[PDB]
Design a protein around this ligand. Structure first.
Ligand SMILES: Nc1ncnc2c1ncn2[C@@H]1O[C@H](COP(=O)(O)OP(=O)(O)O)[C@@H](O)[C@H]1O
Ligand SMILES: [Mg+2]
Length: 363
């Protein structure tokens, strides 16, 4: 029974100030190849940028938070998870004995595997290296970082990774069927943050996405701006709808920081009004939802219980198996995991990663 002592940007067993002190003492950023740091503030939101070097090249990573401390923790741990996700021959198996997850798109049996755990059955299951590591170049589809998370504890990382998978499943459903999600109406501090971020662009719009996992809410934020590169999207998923809203808004601020520095992530220049027209489903909401009307199904006591309850709800969702792969580096004693949900949609990452899709949009 590990208490959640912090639940602003995510569910944490330590205060961000403690974690930052710990990151600094352990020299994690240096050890993970951080060579440059930048501090931004987008309206009221601190954003942190890291330039990182590895054998794979030079990369920009970002962190953010409601406080400068959390943004600096977020940026550091982002760098750590990416270093952990780099291919590691140590944990690759080639002639594995046991259960295997073989995704639909494999025309031939994959050769490299990593041992994971089925979080429903607690049985071992082998996962292809291309579904664990990044970058991995051998296979039919590109590798990616959906479900990759670091934490102070493995439970922190599991919760974060699983919520991310649900988040992208919801977003993938909206894009695949071109669903027009309802506008989400907020009050108090969240409304003030939205207004404050809106002062940076033209408009900041909130949406409640259809979630396929009960007890988990997914929120999208979309911007309208006079500059097209400043029309970004942010997403959040949490059992706490307030956290989901916060996460989406923080992602927008992060997006704006990146665009203003000309940093990108995956032909001629679009106009703001045409971008709107191509994305009518986002800009023409179907209905309205009040945040206070949303039930708190999963209330947050201990980290262990929260993990268990989240896993249960995803296992019930008709989205296949919930698999965890340990990516903790031996030298850096930092818990990192890759969470894969075998039939969750990753359409927004790759058109071929459809997952379990119904014939009709979920009404
Ligand atoms: N307070 C914290 N303690 C430990 N790890 C954290 C903390 N905040 C963020 N992280 C980790 O840092 C990385 C980036 O986090 P963040 O930017 O908050 O959200 P996201 O996971 O949506 O990118 C993730 O691996 C996350 O789990
Ligand atoms: Mg991550």
């Amino acid at each position: 029974m590990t208490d959640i002592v912090y639940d602003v940007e995510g569910f944490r067993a330590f205060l961000p100030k403690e974690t930052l002190r710990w990151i600094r003492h352990r020299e994690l950023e240096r050890k993970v190849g951080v060579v440059e740091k930048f501090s931004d503030r987008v309206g009221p939101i601190p954003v942190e940028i890291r330039r990182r070097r590895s054998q794979y090249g030079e990369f920009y990573h970002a962190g953010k938070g409601t406080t400068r401390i959390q943004a600096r923790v977020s940026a550091a741990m982002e760098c750590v998870e990416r270093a952990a996700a780099e291919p590691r021959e140590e944990i690759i198996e080639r002639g594995p004995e046991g259960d295997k997850w073989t995704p639909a798109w494999y025309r031939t049996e994959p050769r490299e595997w990593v041992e994971g755990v089925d979080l429903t059955t607690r049985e071992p299951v082998y996962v292809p290296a291309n579904e664990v590591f990044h970058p991995w170049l051998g296979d039919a589809l590109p590798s990616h970082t959906n479900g990759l998370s670091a934490g102070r504890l493995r439970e922190e990382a599991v919760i974060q990774g699983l919520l991310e998978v649900v988040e992208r499943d919801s977003w993938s459903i909206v894009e695949y069927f071109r669903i027009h999600p309802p506008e989400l109406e907020v009050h108090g501090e969240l409304e003030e943050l939205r207004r404050s971020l809106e002062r940076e662009v033209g408009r900041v719009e909130l949406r409640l996405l259809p979630s396929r996992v009960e007890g988990v809410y997914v929120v999208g934020a979309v911007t309208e701006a006079e500059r097209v590169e400043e029309m970004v999207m942010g997403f959040g998923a949490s059992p706490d709808p307030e956290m989901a809203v916060l996460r989406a808004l923080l992602e927008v601020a992060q997006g704006l920081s990146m665009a203003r520095r000309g940093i990108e992530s995956p032909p001629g220049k679009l106009t703001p009004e045409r971008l709107k027209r191509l994305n009518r489903h986002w800009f023409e909401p179907e209905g309205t939802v009040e945040i206070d009307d949303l039930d708190r199904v999963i209330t947050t006591g201990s980290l262990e219980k929260l993990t268990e309850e989240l896993v249960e709800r995803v296992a019930e969702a008709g989205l296949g198996k919930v698999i965890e792969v340990d990516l903790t580096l031996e030298n850096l004693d930092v818990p990192v995991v890759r969470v894969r949900v075998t039939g969750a949609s990753e359409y927004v990452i790759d058109e071929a990663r459809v997952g379990n899709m119904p014939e009709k949009p979920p009404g």
